[PDB]
Amino acid sequence: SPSCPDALAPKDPCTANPFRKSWAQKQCSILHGPTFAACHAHVEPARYYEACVNDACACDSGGDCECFCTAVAAYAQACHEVGLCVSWRTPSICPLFCDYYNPEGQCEWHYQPCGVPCLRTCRNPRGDCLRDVRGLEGCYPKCPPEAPIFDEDKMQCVATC
Amino acid sequence: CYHRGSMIPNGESVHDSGAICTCTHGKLSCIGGQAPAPVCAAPMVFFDCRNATPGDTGAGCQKSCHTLDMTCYSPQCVPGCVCPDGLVADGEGGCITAEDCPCVHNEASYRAGQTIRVGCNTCTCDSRMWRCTDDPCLATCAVYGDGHYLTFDGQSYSFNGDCEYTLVQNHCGGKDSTQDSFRVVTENVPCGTTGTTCSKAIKIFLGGFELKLSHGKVEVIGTQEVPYTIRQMGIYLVVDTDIGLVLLWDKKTSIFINLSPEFKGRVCGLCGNFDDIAVNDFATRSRSVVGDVLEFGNSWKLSPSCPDALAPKDPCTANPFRKSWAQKQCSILHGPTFAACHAHVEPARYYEACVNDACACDSGGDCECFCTAVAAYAQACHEVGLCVSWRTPSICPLFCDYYNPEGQCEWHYQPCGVPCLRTCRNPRGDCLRDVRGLEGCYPKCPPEAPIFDEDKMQCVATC
Amino acid sequence: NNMQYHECRSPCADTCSNQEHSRACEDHCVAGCFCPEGTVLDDIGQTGCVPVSKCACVYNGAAYAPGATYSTDCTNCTCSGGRWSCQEVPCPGTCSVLGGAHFSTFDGKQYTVHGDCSYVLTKPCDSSAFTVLAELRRCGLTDSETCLKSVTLSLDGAQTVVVIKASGEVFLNQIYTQLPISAANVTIFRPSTFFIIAQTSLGLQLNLQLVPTMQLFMQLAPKLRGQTCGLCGNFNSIQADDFRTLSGVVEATAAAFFNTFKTQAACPNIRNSFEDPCSLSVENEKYAQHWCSQLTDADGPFGRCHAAVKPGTYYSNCMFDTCNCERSEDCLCAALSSYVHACAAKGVQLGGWRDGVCTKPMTTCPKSMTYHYHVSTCQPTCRSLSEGDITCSVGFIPVDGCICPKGTFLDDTGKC
Amino acid sequence: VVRASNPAHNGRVCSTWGSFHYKTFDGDVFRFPGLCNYVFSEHCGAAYEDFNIQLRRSQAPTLSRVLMKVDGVVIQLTKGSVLVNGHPVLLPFSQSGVLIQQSSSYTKVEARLGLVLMWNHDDSLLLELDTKYANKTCGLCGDFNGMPVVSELLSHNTKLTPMEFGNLQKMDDPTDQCQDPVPEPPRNCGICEELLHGQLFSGCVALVDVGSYLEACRQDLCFCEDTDLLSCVCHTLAEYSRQCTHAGGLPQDWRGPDFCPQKCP
Amino acid sequence: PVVRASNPAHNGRVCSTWGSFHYKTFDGDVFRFPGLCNYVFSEHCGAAYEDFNIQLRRSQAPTLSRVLMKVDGVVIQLTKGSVLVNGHPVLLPFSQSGVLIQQSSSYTKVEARLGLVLMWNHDDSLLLELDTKYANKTCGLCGDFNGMPVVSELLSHNTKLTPMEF
Numbered sequence A: 001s002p003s004c005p006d007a008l009a010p011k012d013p014c015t016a017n018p019f020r021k022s023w024a025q026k027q028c029s030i031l032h033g034p035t036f037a038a039c040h041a042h043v044e045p046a047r048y049y050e051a052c053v054n055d056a057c058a059c060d061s062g063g064d065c066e067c068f069c070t071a072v073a074a075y076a077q078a079c080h081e082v083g084l085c086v087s088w089r090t091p092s093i094c095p096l097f098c099d100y101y102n103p104e105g106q107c108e109w110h111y112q113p114c115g116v117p118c119l120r121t122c123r124n125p126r127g128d129c130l131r132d133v134r135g136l137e138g139c140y141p142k143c144p145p146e147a148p149i150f151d152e153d154k155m156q157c158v159a160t161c
Numbered sequence B: 001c002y003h004r005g006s007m008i009p010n011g012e013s014v015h016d017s018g019a020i021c022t023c024t025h026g027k028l029s030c031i032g033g034q035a036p037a038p039v040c041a042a043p044m045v046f047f048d049c050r051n052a053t054p055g056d057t058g059a060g061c062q063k064s065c066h067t068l069d070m071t072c073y074s075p076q077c078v079p080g081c082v083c084p085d086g087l088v089a090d091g092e093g094g095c096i097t098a099e100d101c102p103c104v105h106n107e108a109s110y111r112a113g114q115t116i117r118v119g120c121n122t123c124t125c126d127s128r129m130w131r132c133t134d135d136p137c138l139a140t141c142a143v144y145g146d147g148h149y150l151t152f153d154g155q156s157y158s159f160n161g162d163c164e165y166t167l168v169q170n171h172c173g174g175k176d177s178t179q180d181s182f183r184v185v186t187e188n189v190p191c192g193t194t195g196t197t198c199s200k201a202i203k204i205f206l207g208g209f210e211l212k213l214s215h216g217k218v219e220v221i222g223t224q225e226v227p228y229t230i231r232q233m234g235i236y237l238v239v240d241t242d243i244g245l246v247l248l249w250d251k252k253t254s255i256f257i258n259l260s261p262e263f264k265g266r267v268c269g270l271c272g273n274f275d276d277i278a279v280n281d282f283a284t285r286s287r288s289v290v291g292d293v294l295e296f297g298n299s300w301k302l303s304p305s306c307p308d309a310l311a312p313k314d315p316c317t318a319n320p321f322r323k324s325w326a327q328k329q330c331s332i333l334h335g336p337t338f339a340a341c342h343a344h345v346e347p348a349r350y351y352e353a354c355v356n357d358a359c360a361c362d363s364g365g366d367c368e369c370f371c372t373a374v375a376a377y378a379q380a381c382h383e384v385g386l387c388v389s390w391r392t393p394s395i396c397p398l399f400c401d402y403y404n405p406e407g408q409c410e411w412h413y414q415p416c417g418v419p420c421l422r423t424c425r426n427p428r429g430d431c432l433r434d435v436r437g438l439e440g441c442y443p444k445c446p447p448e449a450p451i452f453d454e455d456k457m458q459c460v461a462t463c
Numbered sequence C: 001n002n003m004q005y006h007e008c009r010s011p012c013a014d015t016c017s018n019q020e021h022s023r024a025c026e027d028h029c030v031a032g033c034f035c036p037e038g039t040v041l042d043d044i045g046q047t048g049c050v051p052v053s054k055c056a057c058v059y060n061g062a063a064y065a066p067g068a069t070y071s072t073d074c075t076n077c078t079c080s081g082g083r084w085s086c087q088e089v090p091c092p093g094t095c096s097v098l099g100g101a102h103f104s105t106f107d108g109k110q111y112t113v114h115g116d117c118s119y120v121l122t123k124p125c126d127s128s129a130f131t132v133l134a135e136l137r138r139c140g141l142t143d144s145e146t147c148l149k150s151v152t153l154s155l156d157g158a159q160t161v162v163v164i165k166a167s168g169e170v171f172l173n174q175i176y177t178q179l180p181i182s183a184a185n186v187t188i189f190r191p192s193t194f195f196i197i198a199q200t201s202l203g204l205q206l207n208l209q210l211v212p213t214m215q216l217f218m219q220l221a222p223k224l225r226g227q228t229c230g231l232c233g234n235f236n237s238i239q240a241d242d243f244r245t246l247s248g249v250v251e252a253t254a255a256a257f258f259n260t261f262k263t264q265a266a267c268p269n270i271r272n273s274f275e276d277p278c279s280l281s282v283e284n285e286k287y288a289q290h291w292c293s294q295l296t297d298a299d300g301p302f303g304r305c306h307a308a309v310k311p312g313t314y315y316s317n318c319m320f321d322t323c324n325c326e327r328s329e330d331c332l333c334a335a336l337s338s339y340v341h342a343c344a345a346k347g348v349q350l351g352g353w354r355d356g357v358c359t360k361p362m363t364t365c366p367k368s369m370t371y372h373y374h375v376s377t378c379q380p381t382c383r384s385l386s387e388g389d390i391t392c393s394v395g396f397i398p399v400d401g402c403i404c405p406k407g408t409f410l411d412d413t414g415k416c
Numbered sequence D: 001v002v003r004a005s006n007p008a009h010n011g012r013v014c015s016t017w018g019s020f021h022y023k024t025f026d027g028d029v030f031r032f033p034g035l036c037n038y039v040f041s042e043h044c045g046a047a048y049e050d051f052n053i054q055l056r057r058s059q060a061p062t063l064s065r066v067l068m069k070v071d072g073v074v075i076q077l078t079k080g081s082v083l084v085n086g087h088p089v090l091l092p093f094s095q096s097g098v099l100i101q102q103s104s105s106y107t108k109v110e111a112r113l114g115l116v117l118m119w120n121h122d123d124s125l126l127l128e129l130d131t132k133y134a135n136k137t138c139g140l141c142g143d144f145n146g147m148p149v150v151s152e153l154l155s156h157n158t159k160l161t162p163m164e165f166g167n168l169q170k171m172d173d174p175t176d177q178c179q180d181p182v183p184e185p186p187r188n189c190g191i192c193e194e195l196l197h198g199q200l201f202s203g204c205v206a207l208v209d210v211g212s213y214l215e216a217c218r219q220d221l222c223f224c225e226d227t228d229l230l231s232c233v234c235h236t237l238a239e240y241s242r243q244c245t246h247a248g249g250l251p252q253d254w255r256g257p258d259f260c261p262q263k264c265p
Numbered sequence E: 001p002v003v004r005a006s007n008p009a010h011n012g013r014v015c016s017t018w019g020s021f022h023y024k025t026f027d028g029d030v031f032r033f034p035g036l037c038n039y040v041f042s043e044h045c046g047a048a049y050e051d052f053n054i055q056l057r058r059s060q061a062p063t064l065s066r067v068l069m070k071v072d073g074v075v076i077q078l079t080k081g082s083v084l085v086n087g088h089p090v091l092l093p094f095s096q097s098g099v100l101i102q103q104s105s106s107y108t109k110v111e112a113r114l115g116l117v118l119m120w121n122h123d124d125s126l127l128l129e130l131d132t133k134y135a136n137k138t139c140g141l142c143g144d145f146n147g148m149p150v151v152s153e154l155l156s157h158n159t160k161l162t163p164m165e166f
Ligand SMILES: *[C@@H]1O[C@H](CO)[C@@H](O)[C@H](O)[C@H]1NC(C)=O
Pocket: C069, C070, C071, C076, C077
């Protein structure tokens, strides 16, 4: 929209909000420690760390953990795209509620850093993985041999669709 | 305007038989034109005061199963549905005898002989009354968030002290009494910029032994046998002592101290004195009840040289740009998520604490503040037997799958927890109660390996 | 001072405030200056190390002396050895119905239910010597605008029924009477045009504010502790059991326990929602915040009472009532007057608090009457001059309102 | 995944125009001549209210103030003035996901939660709401559920009149007590028939029914205080054109130098 | 994680300097280093984020002139008769951000809730006591805090460092 006001230069997030700065650094040091040690030789964590610190300094309106999780997940996706699947999420650092997707009495959904490009579903019955997407981490189903098909329309393990 | 012989000022309104009639310009205009003659189903008959003989109340002294006071107070006739003589309404249109009315408790109706559980006792309905046993049991002092305290006797308050404070201790008056001296002390640290303060470590001094719950670990500082039992159940760490003291720790900021009834009137600190009276719980270390919360809190600091705390600024006023988010996040406590619990736990103070903490959690970690505030109400709901599920992948997720070994799937989220789960220390699968609704990830051992070894943290066939 | 240097003593030094700090110490011994054995540090007065018997005491930020005493309405404490020894004294209880929806029981428990019926406020459980009823009725388009339309005082098994309406009318035994009345075991009078006071011989007293809205303050003698039961609790100094119904169990919500004290079956069952009226209107919220914040303003007209009465509950009542009811000024004035009456009951006078808002009632009384912030006496009348005795309870919580000026007596035709 | 391929979306639009003509989200068209402060539309379907819009008229059924509460932002629109959080602002103004812009014919407030308010120079207020607010709103624009009458004109199994409903949607000021409008008997009073049923609006008849707008045009022609009968029905025609545009139609120009003329910069 | 403790001798958690340039590391190595420059007393170099960073400076009698502490974003400068917090003079006792600074008749104590205690006494002795969670993660004049006196403090690359070089 040409009528939309032009954007101005924002303030320094860690200068306008110094009381958060320390926390931001202490939160973003995960991008410099043993957690991502293997990825440091394949993805440079400099700009990702800077964005992490700036977002954590500027996420002052509520929901800074979402800002931190997004900032770290950007670097995690960059790491996963180049073949390195590091497990960085812990119950205190961006937990994923995979168990929420388990049907009553079942236990199928597991966290995958690498992802499962060719899990067996009834939209890809053969089990071919198309590539072109790498390291889409998150909760994925592990269907049992009794029901080796995963139906996403109804979202459970079935024998056939 | 006049309604039922009572003067209605202009602009005021009355509500009769579901009709709202407003008095304007000296005339009572009712919504819908005119109220139709109400019709009451059998056996209730509509009694009107047109033929009102002296000394006849009509429907003014007609009782119900909800009106527990059977005395007739109406001095004049009131029109309405009346049951046959000697009958009371059951709330469903019928008429029953007074002794056959079901018991009412927390917006629910229970037939004769039904059983409810209050505290530790059991109450049975019988002829409109509740028959309950008189067994004394524990009291819970709950400290959470940015200095939100609820004492043993039910006194709720907010205190923001920077030093170490005596949460509870015995041997206060006389200092001899009986038993062995115990002392649970909270260590506090500023959490925010508005002057709020939240707990960092919890120190329990029992006998010649000291436990320090800090970060997420326990240290046995120590100096006989250790009179402690540390058990990780759900999101809670439970320290059990043989003197009758239980501590639930959510490992971040929340402590729940359960004290046996044998310690009534023999304790002091920020948790009150446990004598069923809440007003006198604000007793300073000088043994005088004060009205100022700041003075009472500051009197219980461990080190006299520590600076006294001051009244903090209003968080949502000092940080208005967060207020909306707070009000948008804590509204979970008023929505359909906790709707089943609203009749059993009042969410007003929990909502206020949630909003205040979210406003004051401005130095980093808003989600932790919000999750602790909501989990306080969740634990309150769970304690009274309500297994409400509130954690979604977007609202305070728990990483249960983190505990699954390679090629295994056993750990599942439980809102009320598993009270008696088979383990090495409990091979027979026993549950002593005394702790209810400790939500979190619990293992579901398969029949092949049905005993959970906590030390190995694995399902095995035999320990 | 007289401290001595030692190489190994406990760093937890005992003081007047904490005289057992050394026993409750977790650190090891250190070297430094310590008080001589048998004495503790004087942190209150900074006068070096003093004996335990010479330690002072601190109350409300004011340092006392060994042997000095203070007293509250409910207790009497004396300083000794740096600690307060307190003895209980007889203490009357107070229940309050303010704004038509805000209840404060005898034991201090506070709640807010918007009823639409006549409810049992206070009554002995095992007898019917007295009974107080309140007619809380919905007086607006919504279900959360409740007015107290009448208060009923029943004595001796309904053998003496006094109904006081919100319009000031008094009905004794279904007969419209004229105050003052000296009936069986009860005396009802009008200290001013704003209040009606009814005192019984059973230890019960009722203060009824009629301007701008009807509000009730009940006072009960200590002899009835643990015996009454109703919407005002059982008067047994315990707040936990104040929600106990006649069935025998303690309810969890105010609405559930409130609905069990209805008098008629047709009355609705009130369910407490979580509405916030101030959020529904910008202008109403602005008005309520501007005019109700004076309760919590330490340097305002009500600042001389923050030590006696905590204004937080009154501030919440002011905000809710001003934002909710249609006549916002009336509800704001009612909340301010309720706080002022509580302060007067505590013994604090806040005269001159009507400057800025609530000015109208000061200029509305009859021709020969004039306003007064403090009315602690009874209205003199020509009949009082002639007979020599005035029908009054002598001792009551001071009230405000328009009365006859000094040196002027109220004639039987309502003229000074 | 939610699919929507029908451009006709008059169900998500509520508007007021002319001599107190209100069209609810569900299509109900009524007349409520109230000059008080009323709740135009608010989000009462959730614990937290995303939006709250109130409108006030004066005397000439011209709007005098529009009050908006959009996620902690208070927007007040008066004639020639826009206040955000109590302070005057210069348009265009963007803040907290709210964009206010003035044009030659309207003042538009767009909120990224999915609401659009348009205060036109014809003294007509229009409101577009997202489909996520269906069956969760209240006010003069209805409950936004599809049924024109159900749950708006039914208090408790009672058929409410437009007067009663409009009075029920009142929200007064603290010190300003307002008197509800007095229901007046009809005055016993066809220009609109030629244009509304003519070819000029033909491509619009098939999408929006004209009976309600025919009655509205008759009321406006009868109730207006000058004998510019040809030029005293512009508001209803403009509203019908707006509804036709909102229904996926393509109205053609019906104005002129002498018949409802509009001036452009 | 349950960690037991029974031995009350905790000399391994204490590093101090006293007298004529006498230093005792956390591991028990006592040496003399007559340096009058600004030196790192002890800092948390074993993590990506540094919890504490304490530096001390001497002036000529071997007096202590300045103590600089960085504790989780709080800067404390201690000089003779002056305590500065974030560049602002303060009145003791002073509590802020989990750091408590208090003066007694014989010492100035700075306690940090992250687990450190610093004592600047009036006989010109600076004593630091650290929580056991910082073991094997520190550097400076007080050693690497791993319970072994010579290894990792007097060795640069397989060689032996004199106390002056260290
Ligand atoms: C407390 O009681 C004693 C003995 O009855 C009395 O002398 C003293 O004056 C009382 N305290 C006060 C403050 O009056």
